[PDB]
């Protein structure tokens, strides 16, 4: 789901020239906007504690 969201975001940013908004992404995916936000909040890799 995250990978397909990234692919659709890439295609939409290519199409319109700016970053897609959550509502437009939800419309294109035929999925609820709340689910889109939930997916967008979990795509983070933990940051290292040794980073300067």
Partner 1 sequence: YSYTEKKRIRKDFGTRPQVLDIPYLLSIQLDSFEKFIEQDPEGQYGLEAAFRSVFPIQSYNGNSELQYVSYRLGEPVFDVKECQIRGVTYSKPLRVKLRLVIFDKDAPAGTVKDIKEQEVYMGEIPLMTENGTFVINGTERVIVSQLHRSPGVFFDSDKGKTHSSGKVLYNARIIPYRGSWLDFEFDPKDNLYVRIDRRRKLPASIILRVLGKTSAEILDIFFEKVNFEVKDQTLMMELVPERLRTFDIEADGKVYVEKGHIRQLEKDGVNFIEVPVEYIVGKVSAKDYVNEATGELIITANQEISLEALANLSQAGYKKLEVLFTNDLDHGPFMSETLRVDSTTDRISALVEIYRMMRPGEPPTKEAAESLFESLFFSAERYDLSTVGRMKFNSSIGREDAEEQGTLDEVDIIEVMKKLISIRNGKGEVDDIDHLGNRRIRSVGEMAENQFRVGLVRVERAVKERLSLGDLDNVMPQDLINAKPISAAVKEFFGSSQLSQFMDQNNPLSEVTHKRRISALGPGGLTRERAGFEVRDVHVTHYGRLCPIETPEGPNIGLINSLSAFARCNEYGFLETPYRRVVNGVVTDEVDYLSAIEEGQFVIAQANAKLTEEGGFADELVTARQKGESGLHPREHVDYMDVATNQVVSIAASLIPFLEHDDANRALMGANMQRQAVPTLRSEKPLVGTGIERNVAVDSGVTAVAKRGGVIQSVDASRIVVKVNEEELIPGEAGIDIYNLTKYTRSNQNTCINQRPCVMPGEPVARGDVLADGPSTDLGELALGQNMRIAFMPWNGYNFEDSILVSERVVQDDRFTTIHIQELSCVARDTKLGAEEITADIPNVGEAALSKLDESGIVYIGAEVKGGDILVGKVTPKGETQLTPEEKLLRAIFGEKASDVKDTSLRVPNSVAGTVIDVQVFTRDGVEKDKRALEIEQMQLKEAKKDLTEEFQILEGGLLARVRSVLLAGGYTEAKLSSIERKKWLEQTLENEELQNQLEQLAEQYDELKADFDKKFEAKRRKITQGDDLAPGVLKIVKVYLAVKRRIQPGDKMAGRHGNKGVISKINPVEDMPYDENGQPVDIVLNPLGVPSRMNIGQILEVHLGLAAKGIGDKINQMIKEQQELAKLREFLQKVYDLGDTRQRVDISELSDEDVRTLAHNLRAGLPVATPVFDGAPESSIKAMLELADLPASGQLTLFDGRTGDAFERPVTVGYMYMLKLNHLVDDKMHARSTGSYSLVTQQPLGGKAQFGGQRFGEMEVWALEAYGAAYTLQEMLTVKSDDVNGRTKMYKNIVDGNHAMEPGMPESFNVLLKEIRSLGINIELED
**Binding footprint of partner 1 on the chain (CB under 8 A):** 10-11, 13-15, 17-19, 21-23, 33, 37, 40-41
CA atoms within 13 A on the CB side of 3: 0
Least distance CB 30 / partner 1 (angstroms): 19
How many other C-beta atoms can be found within 10 angstroms of the C-beta atom of residue 18?
A: 8
30/41 with CB nearer partner 1 = 41
């Amino acid at each position: 789901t995250i990978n397909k969201l990234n692919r659709i975001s890439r295609q939409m940013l290519q199409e319109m020239g700016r970053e897609p908004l959550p509502e437009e992404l939800a419309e294109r995916m035929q999925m609820p906007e709340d689910k889109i936000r939930k997916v967008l909040k979990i795509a983070k890799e933990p940051i290292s504690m040794e980073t300067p």
